[PDB]
Amino acid sequence: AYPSKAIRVIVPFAPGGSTDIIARLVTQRMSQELGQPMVVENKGGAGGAIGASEAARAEPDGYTLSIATVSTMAVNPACRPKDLPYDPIKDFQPVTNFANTANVVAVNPKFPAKDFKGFLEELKKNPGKYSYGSSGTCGVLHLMGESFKMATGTDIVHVPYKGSGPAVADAVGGQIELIFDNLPSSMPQIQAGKLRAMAIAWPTRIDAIKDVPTFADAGFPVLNQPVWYGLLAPKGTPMDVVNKLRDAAVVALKDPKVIKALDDQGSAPSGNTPEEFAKEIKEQYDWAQDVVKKQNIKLD
Numbered sequence: 001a002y003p004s005k006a007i008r009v010i011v012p013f014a015p016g017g018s019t020d021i022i023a024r025l026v027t028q029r030m031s032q033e034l035g036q037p038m039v040v041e042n043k044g045g046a047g048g049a050i051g052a053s054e055a056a057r058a059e060p061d062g063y064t065l066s067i068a069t070v071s072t073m074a075v076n077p078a079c080r081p082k083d084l085p086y087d088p089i090k091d092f093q094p095v096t097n098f099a100n101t102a103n104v105v106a107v108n109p110k111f112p113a114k115d116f117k118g119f120l121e122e123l124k125k126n127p128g129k130y131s132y133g134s135s136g137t138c139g140v141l142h143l144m145g146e147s148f149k150m151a152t153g154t155d156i157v158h159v160p161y162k163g164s165g166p167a168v169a170d171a172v173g174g175q176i177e178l179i180f181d182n183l184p185s186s187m188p189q190i191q192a193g194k195l196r197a198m199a200i201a202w203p204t205r206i207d208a209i210k211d212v213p214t215f216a217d218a219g220f221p222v223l224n225q226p227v228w229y230g231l232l233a234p235k236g237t238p239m240d241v242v243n244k245l246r247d248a249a250v251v252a253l254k255d256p257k258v259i260k261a262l263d264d265q266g267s268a269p270s271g272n273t274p275e276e277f278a279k280e281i282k283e284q285y286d287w288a289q290d291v292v293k294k295q296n297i298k299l300d
C-alpha cells in the first residue's frame with residue numbers, strides 16, 4: 001500500500017529559492033504523516049523547464065513528484081510555445097496547492113529611494129542603467145520584471161539566474177541593484193536589512209513587513225498578482241495516491257509550526273482540492289498567454 005518506499009520530490013529551481021523553501025517545509029511534515037521519506041531533488045535551469053520536463057517523464061506510480069510553480073505551469077508554456085517539452089496541464093495530475101505566495105520588488109539598500117514613489121523617479125532618471133535579477137528567462141519573475149517595466153514606463157536590464165537563490169545573493173551583494181522575487185527567499189534579507197522591499201504582490205500588507213505597500217497601494221493594481229506552490233504527480237497516477245498525498249498535505253498545513261513559517265515568509269496555506277488547483281493552474285496559464293502574446297510583453 002502506497003507509500004512503501006521513499007518519494008522523490010523534484011524542485012525545478014536551485015536551492016534557497018521560495019520553491020525550495022516551501023517544498024522542504026511542507027514535504028518534511030508530510031513525510032512524518034506518510035511514514036516514508038520525501039526526498040527533495042533540486043533540478044534548476046531554464047526557468048524551471050529542465051526540472052518540469054523531467055518530472056513529466058516520470059512513471060505515474062506516485063514515487064516521483066514535483067513542485068508546481070507559476071513559472072512551470074504558466075509562463076514557460078507562454079515563453080516557449082513550440083518547443084517546451086511538456087504540456088503543464090495534460091502531463092500532470094494536480095494534487096494540491098500548498099500555499100499562496102506574495103511576490104516582491106526589492107532593492108539593494110544603497111539604492112537612493114525609500115519608497116515606491118522615489119523608486120520610480122530614480123529609475124525614470126536613469127533608463128537602461130539599473131539591472132534586476134530573476135529566477136530565469138521563461139519564469140514568472142522575468143515576466144514580473146517586464147510587466148513592471150511596461151506598466152511604470154521604466155527601462156531596467158534583466159539578468160536571469162538559475163533561481164532566486166543566486167539572485168538574492170547578487171542583489172544583497174550589489175551585483176544587481178534590483179530583484180524581482182517571490183517573497184519567502186527575499187524575506188530573511190529584508191528582515192536583516194540587507195534588501196529593502198519596495199512593494200509586495202498580495203491583497204494586503206503583510207505583518208512581517210507591515211510598512212511595505214502592495215502594488216495596489218503603490219497605484220499599480222495590475223501588478224498586484226501573487227503566485228503559489230503546489231504538488232504534482234505525473235498524469236495517470238492513481239487517485240488513491242493523489243488522495244493519500246493530499247490528505248498528508250492537509251495534515252501538514254494544519255501544523256502550527258508550518259502555519260507560522262508560511263505566515264512569516266509571506267505565504268498563506270491553501271490545501272485545496274486537485275480540481276481547485278487545476279483551476280488555479282489554468283487561470284495562471286491563460287493569464288500568461290494573455291500577457292505575453294497580447295499586451296506585447298517580450299520574454300525572449
Ligand SMILES: N[C@@H](CCC(=O)O)C(=O)O
Pocket residue numbers: 013014016017018019020069070071072135139140141162163164165182227
Ligand atoms: N520563480 C519561481 C521560483 C524561483 C525559485 O524558487 O528559485 C516561481 O515561479 O515561483
